[PDB]
Design a binder for this molecule. Structure first.
Ligand SMILES: *[C@@H]1O[C@H](CO)[C@@H](O[C@@H]2O[C@H](CO)[C@@H](O[C@H]3O[C@H](CO)[C@@H](O)[C@H](O)[C@@H]3O)[C@H](O)[C@H]2NC(C)=O)[C@H](O)[C@H]1NC(C)=O
Ligand SMILES: *[C@@H]1O[C@H](CO)[C@@H](O)[C@H](O)[C@H]1NC(C)=O
Lengths: 55, 49
């Protein structure tokens, strides 16, 4: 936001907290200013469907 | 591809295919950044399709 980071990444970039853990998405824009690690659980822009009945 | 063989079971040991390089290679950061950018813009989608 206006060349300013906020939240978890905001508190990590200003070196007020060394490591950050939680539900954080690996992203290109975030990898520029912050260094990530090897992912442990996959994610993406997924779709879900209501379970249709049998036919 | 052939319809004579079938997968079975549920996938285990989720890992990620990766481009490995010697530890002192200076290309690491840019390789990773470009690979993430390719994931984001949808070029990986086109290559998969
Ligand atoms: C990773 O990709 C980066 C893409 O921006 C790149 O940053 C920019 O790279 C260019 C050239 O690679 C630099 O241009 C510099 O090149 C001459 C070499 O004679 C330098 O003397 C000058 O200072 C000139 O700026 C950019 O400066 C550079 N930008 C930044 C912000 O660093 C990286 O160089 C790439 N790194 C690797 C290891 O591939
Ligand atoms: C599937 O069948 C149930 C009956 O058990 C019914 O209540 C439900 O509406 C059916 N699904 C749809 C999408 O209509």
């Amino acid at each position: 936001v206006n060349n300013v980071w906020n939240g978890m990444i905001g508190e990590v970039v200003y070196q007020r907290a060394v490591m950050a853990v939680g539900s954080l998405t690996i992203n290109e824009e975030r990898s520029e200013v912050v260094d990530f690690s090897v992912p442990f659980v996959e994610t993406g822009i997924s779709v879900m469907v209501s379970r249709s009945n049998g036919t | 591809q052939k319809c004579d063989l079938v997968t079975t079971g549920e996938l285990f040991f989720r890992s990620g295919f990766g481009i490995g390089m010697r530890k002192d290679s200076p290309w690491k950061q840019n390789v990773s950044l470009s690979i993430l950018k390719s994931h984001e813009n949808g070029f990986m989608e086109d290559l998969d399709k």
